[PDB]
């Protein structure tokens, strides 16, 4: 019970008992917390509770020090000092933002705004408090017990009465019972086991509530600027393929950390793999939150870097399928590709963290605690999608509040910016450039003349709260008959339920906007489905239309985003 104050570092025995993380608070700060919040239980070697037998006084403001013990107003001896006096709580070794982080329920956007504008130690307190609140919230939903098994990919469930029913999308991963993780999609439901098993009737599923570990390392280490490239040895013979990034690779070697903003198809993976060809002796650990993002870095590495010095780190509890062409779990190979939660304790000359909009401050801190590096590179785009905030229901989280790195890219600007989109037809580049990049994103491709927009509100139906628009899928069906080249298109929408209906009526491969991020397809068919804050989000809109290499068909619901689309309008 001897720790350091989360607000001023002053050595103390005091920890708040009403805080779910029980942070160490100094005498001066513990006071300004207990007197300003409903938090009155103070902890030390022993709790600050009335020592008198059968007495339930636990409020620190209703307690005193009677010699060496603690008592309330009704049990204190004559020679007793109040615990709360002169702006201090009695302790050994003798706040507005801390109070709000300590007592908030994390359902409001202003909670996440504060969690990112506060001091660095408050960002860590905010990050483990939030994560602990998110885990304890999982204990609230109901158990799904199997009622009947139809086939290898379909079943019927019986839900627990009196406890809510969680959203049945791939975002929510149940743990079967210990018969492996299982995912679900829409009374005939579709079941997806990570481990192949002949689903037993009566066997039950539950949401795994992993333990939240305390955070030690900052989200961002303190910045260092150098006068020359430090600990890295560049090549003079660097292929013309990577010549565009030489000046940026040098910036990478002359700073402790650097930020790269890369709009869709501007060459982020190329920059990341090319950083290894520029510092060919450097050991580089490549990391991201998702397995898909780590796999996208493995694909680009497999093309330019020696396959023998590569290794894809897979956690022992292997959940879903990932990259199979590197030696698995060889921690000491020069190039290590691994997700943030699976990172071993190691050092590196460079750490590359990709898809930075998807990271939380918890992930930012974890990377700094597991990896000790000469240089850190954060690659991503704050105009793309962030990590889902399951508790957040009121308000919209702006990009400068996604994490510390995103806050930096939006306020002081990114250190590096890839300005030429090589993927998209100019119609798409011109739309997103004006929408989210302040007209700074340039088109390498010409206009494809295969980008269409239709304004069709249709009819909105709902599977629980996930939306469907059958008339918008009907409009797509009529379009496909007159445009058979579009037979090879990927159907994208902001809702899983819309995607489930489109898969059966159109037969096209389906993808949510959130699961499409990082991927590219020749043709994309997007139905907006609704006019909600979710389907109108400019980051989601940006990701949705920047997936296409050749053409896109956008069936819009919102007049605003329809009018901004620089596409050929269609009739019906
Ligand atoms: C018909 N749409 C279109 C075409 C070319 C350039 C700009 C637009 S707009 C005004 O909708 O942004
Ligand atoms: Zn507290
Ligand atoms: Zn303090
Ligand atoms: Zn008492």
3-state SS assignment for residue 157: strand
Classify 126 in phi/psi space as left (phi over 0), alpha (psi -120 to 50) or beta: alpha
CB-side neighbour CA atoms (13 Å) of 488 = 9
Are the beta carbons of 218 and 157 closer than 8 angstroms? no
Please state, in angstroms and rounded to a whole number, the distance separating the CA atoms of residues 412 and 430.
Answer: 25
Closest ligand relative to 102 C-alpha: 2
Please answer whether residues 522 and 528 qualify as being in contact, where contact means their C-beta atoms are separated by less than 8 angstroms. no
Task: Count Cβ atoms below 10 Å from residue 379 Cβ, excluding itself.
Answer: 26
Say how far apart CA 449 and CA 502 lie, in whole Å.
Answer: 25
Phi, psi of 325 (to 5 degrees): -100, 10
* Tokens representing residue 465 in the block: 């709260």
Separation between Cα atoms, residue 258 and residue 270, nearest integer Å? 16
The closest residue, in CA terms, to atom 3 on ligand 1 is 566
| Cβ–ligand 1 contact at 433 (below 6 Å) | no
Residues 6+ apart with CB under 8 A from 47: 17, 41, 58
Rounded to 5°, the CA angle 265-246-434 comes to 35
The structure tokens listed for 40 are 């009155």
- Residue 82 three-state SS: strand
**359 three-class SS:** coil
Report the DSSP pairing between strands 371-380 and 257-261. parallel
Report which bound ligand comes closest to the CA of 17.
2
> Nearest CA to 452 among 540, 548, 534, 560?
548
Rounded CA gap, 395 and 566, in Å? 29
Of 458, 452, 453, nearest to 472 (Cα)? 458
- CB count within 10 Å of CB 390 equals 15
Report whether 192 contacts 185 (CB < 8 A). Answer: yes
Coil, strand or helix: which one is 516?
helix
The overall longest dimension of the chain from CA atoms, in Å, is 94
For ligand 1, say whether the CB of 564 is within 6 Å of any of its atoms.
Answer: yes
| Count of C-beta atoms within a 10 Å radius of residue 76 | 20
- Ligand sitting nearest the alpha carbon of 431: 1
For residue 166, the 8-state DSSP code is -
d(Cα 544, Cα 526) in Å, to the nearest integer? 7
Tell me how the structure was determined: X-ray
Cα dist from 563 to 109, 139, 289, 419, 567, whole Å: 29, 44, 35, 25, 9
Nearest to 452 by CA among 372, 569, 339: 569
CB within 8 Å of 479: residues ≥ 6 apart? 486, 525, 553, 570
Distance CA 141, CA 533 (A): 25
Q: How far is it, in rounded angstroms, from Cα 497 to Cα 185?
A: 8
**CA–CA dist 354, 312 (Å, integer):** 15
Which one-letter DSSP state was computed for residue 80? E
Q: Is 121 helix (H, G, I), strand (E, B) or coil?
A: helix
Name the token pair of 18. 């009403």
Q: Which residues contact 23 (CB under 8 A, 6 or more apart)?
A: 6, 15, 16, 102, 125
Tell me if 478 CB under 6 Å of ligand 1: no
Q: Compute the distance between CA of residue 570 and CA of residue 572 in angstroms, rounded to an integer.
A: 7
Q: Is 345 exposed, middle or buried (0-12, 13-18, 19+ CB in 10 A)?
A: exposed
Q: Is 112 strand, coil or helix?
A: helix
Distance (Å, whole) CA 329 – CA 97: 42
Distance CA(345)–CA(217), nearest Å, equals 13
Distance of CA 310 to the CA centre of its chain: 26
CA dihedral 139, 192, 342, 402 (to 10 degrees): -70
Do residues 25 and 7 make contact, with C-beta atoms less than 8 angstroms apart?
Answer: yes
Q: How many CB atoms within 10 Å of residue 96? A: 9
**Helix (H) and strand (E) counts in the chain:** 15, 33
Q: Which residues are annotated as a binding site for a ribonucleoside 5'-triphosphate?
A: 262-269
Ligand nearest, relative to CA of residue 16: 2
Q: What resolution in angstroms, rounded to 1 decimal? A: 2.2
Kindly report the protein residue whose alpha carbon is nearest to atom 6 of ligand 1.
566
Hey, what are 314's tokens?
């897979």
Contacts of 20 (CB under 8 A, 6+ apart): 129, 132, 133, 136
With tokens 């020592």, the residue in question is: 51
Strand duo 335-339 + 327-328: pairing: unpaired
Nearest CA to ligand 1 atom 4: 566
SS3 of 297-322: the string is HHHHHHHHCCHHHEEEECCCCCCCCC
Q: Count the neighbouring beta carbons within 10 Å of the beta carbon of residue 36.
A: 15
Q: Indicate the annotated binding residues.
A: 5, 8, 16, 19, 26, 29, 33, 39, 50, 55, 72, 75, 262-269
Please check whether residue 192 is in contact with residue 152, taking contact to mean a CB–CB distance below 8 angstroms: no
In angstroms, rounded to a whole number, what is the distance separating the alpha carbons of residues 378 and 262? 10
For ligand 1, the distance from its centroid to the CA atom of residue 357, given in whole angstroms, is: 29
The span from the CA of 29 to the CA of 6, in Å, is 9
Nearest residue (CA) to ligand 1, atom 8: 566
CATH number of 426-555: 3.40.50.300
Q: Output the residue whose Cα is nearest ligand 1's atom 5.
A: 566
How far apart, in whole angstroms, are the C-alpha atoms of residue 148 and residue 187? Answer: 11
Ligand 1 atom 7: residue of nearest CA: 566
**Which residue, judged by its Cα, is nearest atom 9 of ligand 1?**
566
Q: SS3 string of 14-40?
A: CEECCCCCCCECCHHHHHHHHCCCCCC
Beta bridge partners of 272: none
3-class SS at 514?
helix
What are the structure tokens assigned to 392, written together? 């957040």
Contact 555, 456 (CB under 8 A): yes
Q: Is the dihedral of CA 88, 94, 99, 102 positive or negative?
A: negative
Cα-based angle 436, 261, 426 (whole degrees, multiple of 5): 50
Q: Which residues surround ligand 2, an ion (CB under 5 A)?
A: 16, 18-19, 39, 102
Helix (H) or strand (E) holding 11: strand 11-12
Return d(Cα 490, Cα 526) in angstroms, integer: 8
Separation CA 95–CA 269 (nearest Å)? 42
Mutate to test the pocket of ligand 1, among 435, 453, 566 (most ligand atoms within 8 A of CB): 566
| Atom of ligand 1 at shortest range from CA of 569 | 1
Q: Is 566 in the pocket of ligand 1 (CB under 6 A)?
A: yes
Please, is 465 exposed, middle or buried when counting C-beta atoms within 10 Å of its C-beta (0-12, 13-18, 19+)?
Answer: exposed
- Is the CB of 410 within 6 Å of ligand 1? no
569 C-beta closer than 6 A to ligand 1? yes
Tokens representing 321 are 């399928």
| Pocket lining: 281 vs ligand 1, CB cutoff 6 Å | no
Q: Residue 181, CB half-sphere, CA atoms under 13 Å: how many?
A: 14
- CA neighbor of 264 nearest in space, from 564, 559, 520: 520
**What residues does 527 pair with on adjacent strands?**
555
358 vs 380: CA distance, rounded Å:
8
Instruction: Using the Cα atoms of residue 11, residue 14, residue 15 and residue 16 in order, give the sign of their dihedral.
Output: negative
Going by C-alpha positions, the residue among 43, 17, 41, 12 that lies closest to residue 28 is 12
How far, rounded to the nearest angstrom, does the alpha carbon of residue 225 sit from its chain's CA centroid?
Answer: 28
Among residues 159, 158, 193, 168, the alpha carbon closest in space to that of 179 is found at: 193
Residue 138: its H or E element: helix 120-138
* Ordered strands of the 181-185 beta sheet: 155-159, 144-149, 204-207, 174-176, 181-185, 190-193
Angle at 530 between CA 528 and CA 534, to 5 degrees: 85
Q: Cβ neighbours of residue 507 under 8 Å, at least 6 residues apart?
A: none
- Ligand at minimal distance from the CA of 556 is 1
Going 287 to 291 to 293 to 297, the CA torsion angle's sign is: positive
Tokens of 209: 């509530």
213: DSSP letter: P
What is the residue whose two structure tokens read 């709000």? 100
Tell me the angle at which helices 404-411 and 109-117 cross, rounded to the nearest 10 degrees. Answer: 80
Of 293, 495, 322, the closest CA to residue 380 belongs to 293
- Which residue(s) pair with 524 in the sheet? 490, 552
Rounded Cα gap, residues 531 and 401, in angstroms = 24
Q: Is the CB of 563 under 6 A from ligand 1?
A: yes
List the structure tokens of 482. Answer: 């007159």
For residue 1, how many other CB atoms are within 10 A of its CB? Answer: 12
H or E element at residue 466 = strand 466-468
**Angle in degrees, CA 268, 518, 483, rounded to 5:** 120
Q: What is the CA angle 502-541-428, rounded to 5?
A: 100
Q: Give yes or no for a contact between 355 and 288, defined as CB atoms under 8 angstroms apart.
A: yes
Which residue's alpha carbon is nearest to atom 2 within ligand 1?
566
> 190-193 and 548-556: which strand pairing?
unpaired
DSSP one-letter code for 69: E
């Amino acid at each position: 019970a001897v720790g350091a104050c989360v607000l001023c570092n002053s050595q103390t025995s005091l920890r708040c008992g009403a805080c779910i993380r029980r942070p160490f608070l100094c005498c001066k700060c513990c006071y300004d917390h207990v007197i300003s919040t409903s938090h009155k239980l103070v902890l030390s070697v022993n709790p600050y509770v009335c020592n008198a037998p059968g007495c339930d006084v636990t409020d620190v403001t209703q307690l005193y020090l009677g010699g060496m013990s603690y008592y309330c107003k009704s049990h204190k001896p004559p020679i007793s000092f109040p615990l709360c006096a002169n702006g201090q709580v009695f302790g050994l070794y003798k706040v507005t933002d801390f109070n709000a982080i300590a007592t908030c329920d994390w359902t409001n956007a202003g909670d996440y705004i504060l969690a990112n504008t506060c001091t660095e130690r408050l960002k860590l307190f905010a990050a483990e408090t939030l994560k602990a609140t998110e885990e304890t919230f999982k204990l609230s939903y109901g158990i799904a017990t199997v009622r009947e098994v139809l086939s290898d990919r379909e079943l019927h469930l019986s839900w627990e009465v009196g406890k809510p029913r969680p959203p049945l999308n791939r975002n929510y991963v149940f743990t079967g019972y210990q018969i492996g993780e299982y995912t679900f999609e829409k009374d005939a439901v579709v079941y997806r086991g990570t481990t192949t098993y002949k689903l037993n009737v009566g066997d039950y599923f539950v949401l795994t509530s992993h333990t939240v570990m305390p955070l030690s390392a900052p989200t961002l280490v303190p910045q260092e600027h150098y006068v020359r490239i430090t600990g890295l040895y560049p090549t003079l013979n660097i292929s013309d393929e990577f010549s565009s990034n030489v000046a940026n690779y040098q910036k990478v070697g002359m700073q402790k950390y650097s930020t790269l903003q890369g709009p869709p198809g501007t060459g982020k993976s190329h920059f990341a793999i090319g950083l290894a060809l520029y510092y060919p002796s450097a050991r580089i650990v490549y990391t991201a939150c998702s397995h898909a993002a780590v796999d996208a870095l493995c694909e680009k590495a497999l093309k330019y870097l020696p396959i023998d010095k590569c290794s894809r780190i897979i956690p022992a509890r292997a959940r879903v399928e990932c990259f199979d062409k590197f030696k698995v779990n060889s921690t000491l190979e020069q190039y290590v590709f691994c997700t943030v939660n699976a990172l071993p304790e190691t050092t590196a000359d460079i750490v590359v963290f990709d898809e930075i909009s998807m990271a939380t401050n918890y992930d930012l801190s974890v990377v700094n605690a597991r990896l000790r590096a000469k240089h850190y590179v954060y690659i991503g785009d704050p105009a793309q999608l962030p990590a889902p905030r399951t508790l957040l229901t009121k308000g919209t989280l702006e990009p400068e509040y996604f994490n510390s790195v995103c806050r930096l890219m939006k306020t002081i600007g990114p250190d590096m910016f890839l300005g030429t989109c090589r993927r998209c037809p100019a119609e798409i580049v011109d739309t997103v450039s004006a929408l989210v990049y302040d007209n700074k994103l340039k088109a390498h491709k010409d206009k494809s003349a295969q980008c269409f927009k239709m304004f069709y509100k249709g009819v909105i139906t709902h599977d629980v709260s996930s939306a469907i628009n059958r008339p918008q899928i009907g409009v797509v069906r009529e379009f496909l008959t007159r445009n058979p080249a579009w037979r090879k298109a990927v159907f994208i929408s902001p809702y899983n339920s819309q995607n489930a209906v489109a898969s059966k009526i159109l037969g096209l491969p389906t993808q949510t906007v959130d699961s499409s991020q990082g991927s590219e397809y020749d043709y994309v068919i997007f139905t907006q489905t609704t006019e909600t804050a979710h389907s109108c989000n400019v980051n989601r809109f940006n990701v949705a239309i920047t997936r296409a290499k050749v053409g896109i068909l956008c069936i819009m619901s919102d007049r605003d985003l329809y009018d901004k689309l620089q596409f050929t309008s269609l009739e019906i």
